[PDB]
Design a protein around this motif. Structure first.
Motif, mmCIF file in Angstrom:
data_model
loop_
_atom_site.group_PDB
_atom_site.id
_atom_site.type_symbol
_atom_site.label_atom_id
_atom_site.label_comp_id
_atom_site.label_asym_id
_atom_site.label_seq_id
_atom_site.Cartn_x
_atom_site.Cartn_y
_atom_site.Cartn_z
ATOM 1 N N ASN C 4 0.829 -1.196 0.000
ATOM 2 C CA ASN C 4 0.000 0.000 0.000
ATOM 3 C C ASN C 4 0.867 1.251 0.000
ATOM 4 O O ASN C 4 1.903 1.285 0.670
ATOM 5 C CB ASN C 4 -0.931 0.041 1.226
ATOM 6 C CG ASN C 4 -2.068 -1.001 1.249
ATOM 7 O OD1 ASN C 4 -2.159 -1.898 0.394
ATOM 8 N ND2 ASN C 4 -2.929 -0.871 2.267
ATOM 9 N N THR C 5 0.405 2.301 -0.704
ATOM 10 C CA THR C 5 0.989 3.632 -0.669
ATOM 11 C C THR C 5 -0.062 4.709 -0.692
ATOM 12 O O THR C 5 -1.269 4.454 -0.826
ATOM 13 C CB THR C 5 1.994 3.866 -1.782
ATOM 14 O OG1 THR C 5 2.667 5.092 -1.510
ATOM 15 C CG2 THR C 5 1.338 3.976 -3.104
ATOM 16 N N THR C 6 0.431 5.914 -0.532
ATOM 17 C CA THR C 6 -0.322 7.153 -0.613
ATOM 18 C C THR C 6 0.076 8.041 -1.824
ATOM 19 O O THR C 6 -0.679 8.969 -2.159
ATOM 20 C CB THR C 6 -0.111 7.960 0.662
ATOM 21 O OG1 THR C 6 1.283 8.283 0.771
ATOM 22 C CG2 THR C 6 -0.531 7.133 1.856
ATOM 23 N N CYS C 7 1.248 7.738 -2.451
ATOM 24 C CA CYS C 7 1.908 8.408 -3.561
ATOM 25 C C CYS C 7 2.636 7.365 -4.398
ATOM 26 O O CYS C 7 3.374 6.530 -3.865
ATOM 27 C CB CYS C 7 2.908 9.469 -3.054
ATOM 28 S SG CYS C 7 3.800 10.367 -4.361
ATOM 29 N N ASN C 15 6.948 6.391 0.054
ATOM 30 C CA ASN C 15 6.343 6.354 1.389
ATOM 31 C C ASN C 15 7.109 7.313 2.305
ATOM 32 O O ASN C 15 8.190 6.975 2.799
ATOM 33 C CB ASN C 15 6.321 4.915 1.941
ATOM 34 C CG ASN C 15 5.761 4.813 3.397
ATOM 35 O OD1 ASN C 15 4.576 5.122 3.617
ATOM 36 N ND2 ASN C 15 6.611 4.404 4.349
ATOM 37 N N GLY C 29 -1.316 10.796 -6.466
ATOM 38 C CA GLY C 29 -1.508 10.695 -5.025
ATOM 39 C C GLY C 29 -1.158 11.951 -4.252
ATOM 40 O O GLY C 29 -0.955 13.025 -4.824
ATOM 41 N N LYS C 30 -1.162 11.841 -2.926
ATOM 42 C CA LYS C 30 -0.892 13.003 -2.068
ATOM 43 C C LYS C 30 0.605 13.105 -1.847
ATOM 44 O O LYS C 30 1.107 12.777 -0.771
ATOM 45 C CB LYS C 30 -1.601 12.891 -0.737
ATOM 46 C CG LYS C 30 -3.080 12.934 -0.840
ATOM 47 C CD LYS C 30 -3.721 12.831 0.513
ATOM 48 C CE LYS C 30 -5.228 12.888 0.417
ATOM 49 N NZ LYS C 30 -5.869 12.774 1.754
ATOM 50 N N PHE D 55 -4.999 15.083 -3.196
ATOM 51 C CA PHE D 55 -4.733 13.941 -4.050
ATOM 52 C C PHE D 55 -4.729 14.434 -5.474
ATOM 53 O O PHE D 55 -5.700 15.053 -5.915
ATOM 54 C CB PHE D 55 -5.852 12.918 -3.900
ATOM 55 C CG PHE D 55 -5.638 11.619 -4.579
ATOM 56 C CD1 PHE D 55 -5.105 10.557 -3.880
ATOM 57 C CD2 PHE D 55 -5.948 11.440 -5.904
ATOM 58 C CE1 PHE D 55 -4.907 9.347 -4.491
ATOM 59 C CE2 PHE D 55 -5.738 10.233 -6.502
ATOM 60 C CZ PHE D 55 -5.224 9.195 -5.803
ATOM 61 N N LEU E 45 -3.248 2.316 -4.342
ATOM 62 C CA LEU E 45 -3.493 3.661 -3.829
ATOM 63 C C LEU E 45 -4.736 3.639 -3.025
ATOM 64 O O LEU E 45 -5.811 3.324 -3.523
ATOM 65 C CB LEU E 45 -3.655 4.744 -4.904
ATOM 66 C CG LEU E 45 -2.469 5.090 -5.758
ATOM 67 C CD1 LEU E 45 -2.893 6.030 -6.840
ATOM 68 C CD2 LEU E 45 -1.437 5.793 -4.923
ATOM 69 N N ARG E 46 -4.604 3.980 -1.765
ATOM 70 C CA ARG E 46 -5.759 3.994 -0.882
ATOM 71 C C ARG E 46 -6.450 2.635 -0.862
ATOM 72 O O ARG E 46 -7.673 2.548 -0.812
ATOM 73 C CB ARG E 46 -6.765 5.045 -1.343
ATOM 74 C CG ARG E 46 -6.231 6.461 -1.374
ATOM 75 C CD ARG E 46 -7.193 7.414 -1.982
ATOM 76 N NE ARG E 46 -7.375 7.134 -3.405
ATOM 77 C CZ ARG E 46 -8.182 7.808 -4.256
ATOM 78 N NH1 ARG E 46 -8.892 8.838 -3.848
ATOM 79 N NH2 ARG E 46 -8.239 7.418 -5.518
#
Ligand SMILES: *[C@@H]1O[C@H](CO)[C@@H](O)[C@H](O)[C@H]1NC(C)=O
Ligand SMILES: *[C@@H]1O[C@H](CO)[C@@H](O)[C@H](O)[C@H]1NC(C)=O
Ligand SMILES: *[C@@H]1O[C@H](CO)[C@@H](O)[C@H](O)[C@H]1NC(C)=O
Ligand SMILES: *[C@@H]1O[C@H](CO)[C@@H](O)[C@H](O)[C@H]1NC(C)=O
Ligand SMILES: *[C@@H]1O[C@H](CO)[C@@H](O)[C@H](O)[C@H]1NC(C)=O
Ligand SMILES: *[C@@H]1O[C@H](CO)[C@@H](O)[C@H](O)[C@H]1NC(C)=O
Ligand SMILES: *[C@@H]1O[C@H](CO)[C@@H](O)[C@H](O)[C@H]1NC(C)=O
Lengths: 108, 110, 51, 163, 108, 163, 163, 108, 110
Positions: C4-7, C15, C29-30, D55, E45-46
């Motif tokens: 899993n990642t956010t970016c 990460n 992503g963020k 995002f 992602l998410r």
């Protein structure tokens, strides 16, 4: 200096009754005032150290209020322990410190 | 915390040495003052001394007659009353001043 | 891969909580902002002087 | 002001070194050290915490006859890149200049706390050091370091040993 | 011969920083604000997996190019992944109208 | 602290003026001056050196029916312009505030170097000046300016001439 | 340095409190206060005045088949938003740090003006206060506050009362 | 204080042979240690001023190493000039300075 | 750079004045110490003095018997040994300490 007077020379209420004392200054004090309660034969005890802020060791029965020249002490419920002579001092202007004459609070 | 000696009484024109000793206070970080309660009267401030000993104040009513000295090593405060008048018979008290001298000075310990 | 990642960038997932990255201009992503810099080191400590 | 740091001092950023008849060594000034740490830690976190990315999706695709748009997209990415790179470099350099001065200020303030406390009971020698005129044992050193030193207590010994 | 010295911590750190006025200043402690690492993997992602088309491009997958039949179908996609080597779609030569707009709509 | 600068002092930013039986004039404190110069020179270069523009082409052309895009392009240029203008103005003002304080700090530090070195052998008079109690010839002035002054050497003369 | 502020002092940011045989109270040091005010007021105005927005129109409308452009427009708005938000937060924090240090510096400088002026005619006691060795009446207090105090005039009384 | 001892009371090797001496402390020193080489009839000469860092005027033949409590002197090749008594001092904790007993290095 | 005089020997219960003069050093920026080497023994530190003269240390073994004074104007170091014991017969050396006093003190010049 600043002349302090106290108009209610005698405050006499029944036990448990709410009662107040007034102090008046000839000059603005701006809350740089203190209140004392003196039992006969004793040095006076400090009750409120600021015009309104309560001194350490003093019960919730006492609190004060005030502005530039007019100050008040409120006794929420006078107790059998509280007949005393009360005084206001000031410390806004004090080569000397000054005090008002003081007044007595008595119980009916 | 503080013991007081009023000096007893003398006739007008005489003099008295008054003295207080404190044990519950440092007496080096605090200033002291004298307050006089004449019987039947209100409470009168009489005199003040700082702990540095360099600063002293007197009520106009006692100027030229009363004087203060202190010795921090002995925890003692001395007051010399000269040229006494009938009006000077009163109860004298030693009062420890507040720590916050330049602002709020409310005489918390008697 | 099952991670899993956010970016995410084409070179692999990123990460981090840091504000800047110098891995790749294109992300999803963020993500941290892309910079051309190779070093953004913020001192926290003392000037280090053994002698 | 001070030539360099100490390596035996491993319990904090700021502190004292002493030598007396009963012993020697280093100890941190914990109040000074902790305040410096909290200040700086918060500073670092602020730099990081303040940025809040939404995002997004950066890449875009354009075709054979959309070159002007593709070039517009590039213009946008390049503009943002130069702004962030330039601001990031300057921010870090500016913060580093101040962090280092901050630390130097704290060292001087520690020095002054002691100089003011000791007055004439110690000779000020230099490079961060003082020498006591009077005997100053472990109890004394702790009261100086703790801000509780009694100047008058030793003033007689100190002046006698001065000349 | 009782003495007291005031100073500061030193360390064996080789981490340097630049400042406005100076370059290559060694400090005892430092923090890195710039991320230069990646894990070499494409991640969710998410929590949602990418759609990986492998050797096919989107047109191949949507039209049903004979070689995209082996691709699995996910009910949701977080992003779409194509390899640089991808080259399967529009096998019968012709234009795919508003292809880029379709690709954008299907990305998630 | 100090009322103004000197014009006869033309060999550096920071320095000394002296008068003694053998002569008078101005001379720069070269170590102080050079360090200030190198610090500042590097500062200026950093502001300039950190920006790195890619080869670009700003203008774009749009036709009769592409007004929304043309306006998008304008939006982008205006946004970047406001960011750069605002940041450039603030950066310069902030750096100027610090450059001037930096210089003032260095002057005070120069003063302290001397005050600490001279101790009781000179009267501190004010506005950056000291007066020697003892005779202080060209050899003496150089040792004070150079940080090599021997306090004990003149302490007897200086105290005798004090009262 | 100083434990807290004063509330009776209502005529300016910086000032003096005094007590002498003839009276007591607070008064502002008007030169110090006004200079601090003008400096800060100008600082605030600079932060505001430097931004100069052109008349614009932010919103754009795109249709069913122009999603890539709509997303480009969003990219532009988001990029500008992050830049302005981040820079605005840091600018304010940085300026606040300096405003507060600026004020603390001015208080110390006020203290030093007096310490240097009084020299040995007053004991330095601490927490911003001095005690005169000699009698110092209203005329004296004004000359100290105004920077016009005559040290020699009282030096005999002051040294006699020192021991 | 910190008690220093030296176990290899006699170190005896042939000319040109590599040889070492150990020093041990009762308390952590943290490299605040120094080594000396004393020729008979002479004051001792400082050879290494830190636990490991070589003193000015000393040849490459000598170097040291060490940690918290354990320290070593290495002689890379003992010369005819080097029979001597060697000592460790410490300066980590020193109202007094202290030294170990010292050991002798001799040539076969 | 440094000349030493051991004072010769006396019988127990007596006293000796020891003295060193330095010409190769400022002797104002450096501290000095005395180290004693008894024949057949290890090397013992005995005493220390800073250049300010305000700071002195002695080994417990000599406390109350040995004392140090110095005169920077003469570049000289003096040691007075009182109430001598048989155990005090030794070679005494004057050692110039390191310049970096508060940290690394390694006795570089003998
Ligand atoms: C990803 O997040 C989901 C929750 O949204 C969690 O169930 C899953 O285990 C995580 N995957 C990995 C590889 O940690
Ligand atoms: C991201 O890094 C943090 C440490 O900074 C770690 O705790 C976390 O598990 C990492 N996240 C993933 C998905 O591996
Ligand atoms: C230092 O201060 C603490 C209170 O924070 C007190 O308990 C301790 O006894 C003090 N130490 C000395 C040496 O006075
Ligand atoms: C500092 O020394 C310790 C051992 O005491 C070691 O573990 C650490 O890696 C060293 N740090 C550096 C930067 O060399
Ligand atoms: C800083 O150190 C690096 C090596 O780590 C070197 O390449 C660089 O030129 C140095 N910069 C300066 C200003 O000395
Ligand atoms: C000043 O210092 C230099 C070394 O940098 C020295 O050569 C010169 O003689 C010194 N001048 C004086 C007056 O001591
Ligand atoms: C203070 O300075 C003013 C001039 O600005 C002068 O008129 C005034 O008399 C001075 N006050 C005192 C006490 O010297």
């Amino acid at each position: 200096e600043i002349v302090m007077t106290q108009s209610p020379a005698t405050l006499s209420v029944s036990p448990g009754e709410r009662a107040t004392l007034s102090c008046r200054a000839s000059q603005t004090i701006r809350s740089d005032l203190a209140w004392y309660q003196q039992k006969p034969g004793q040095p006076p005890r400090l009750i409120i150290y600021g015009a309104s802020t309560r001194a350490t060791g003093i019960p919730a029965r006492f609190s004060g209020s005030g502005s530039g020249t007019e100050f008040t002490l409120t006794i929420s419920s006078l107790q059998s322990e509280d007949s005393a002579v009360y005084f206001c001092q000031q410390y806004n202007n004090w080569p000397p410190l000054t005090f008002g004459g003081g007044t007595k609070v008595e119980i009916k | 915390q503080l013991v007081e000696s009023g000096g007893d009484l003398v006739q007008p024109g005489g003099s008295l040495r008054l003295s207080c000793v404190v044990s519950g206070f440092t007496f080096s970080t605090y200033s002291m003052n004298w307050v006089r309660q004449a019987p039947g009267k209100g409470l009168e401030w009489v005199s003040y001394i700082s702990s540095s000993s360099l600063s002293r104040y007197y009520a106009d009513s006692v100027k030229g007659r009363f004087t203060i000295s202190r010795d921090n090593a002995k925890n003692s405060l001395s007051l010399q009353l000269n040229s006494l008048r009938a009006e000077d018979t009163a109860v004298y008290y030693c009062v420890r001043g507040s720590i916050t001298w330049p602002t709020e000075y409310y005489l918390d310990y008697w | 891969h099952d991670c899993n990642t956010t970016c995410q960038t084409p070179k692999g997932a990123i990460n981090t909580s840091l504000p800047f990255q110098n891995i790749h201009p294109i992300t999803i992503g963020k993500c941290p902002k892309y910079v051309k810099s190779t070093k953004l080191r913020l001192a926290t400590g003392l000037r280090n002087i053994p002698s | 002001f001070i030539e360099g740091g100490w390596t035996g001092m491993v319990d904090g950023w700021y502190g004292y070194h002493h030598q007396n008849e009963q012993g020697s060594g280093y100890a941190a000034d914990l109040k000074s050290t902790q305040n410096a740490i909290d200040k700086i830690t918060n500073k670092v976190n602020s730099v990081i915490e303040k940025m809040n990315t939404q995002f997004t999706a950066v890449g875009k695709e354009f075709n054979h006859l959309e070159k002007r748009i593709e070039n517009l997209n590039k213009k946008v990415d390049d503009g943002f890149l130069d702004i962030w790179t330039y601001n990031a470099e300057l921010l870090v350099l500016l913060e580093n200049e101040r962090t280092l001065d901050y630390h130097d200020s704290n060292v001087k303030n520690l020095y002054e706390k002691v100089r003011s406390q000791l007055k004439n009971n110690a000779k000020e020698i230099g490079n961060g050091c003082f020498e006591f005129y009077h005997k100053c044992d472990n109890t004394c050193m702790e009261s100086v370091k703790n801000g509780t030193y009694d100047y008058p207590k030793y003033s007689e010994e100190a002046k006698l040993n001065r000349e | 011969g009782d003495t007291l010295c005031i100073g500061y911590h030193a360390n064996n750190s080789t981490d340097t920083v630049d400042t406005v006025l100076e370059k290559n200043v060694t400090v005892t402690h430092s923090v890195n604000l710039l991320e230069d690492k990646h894990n070499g993997k494409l991640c969710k992602l998410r929590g949602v997996a990418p759609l990986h088309l492998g050797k096919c491009n989107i047109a191949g997958w949507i039209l049903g190019n004979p070689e995209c039949e082996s691709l699995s179908t996910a009910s949701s996609w977080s992003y779409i992944v194509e390899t640089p080597s991808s080259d399967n779609g529009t096998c019968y030569p012709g234009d795919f109208i508003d292809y880029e707009e379709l690709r954008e709509q299907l990305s998630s």
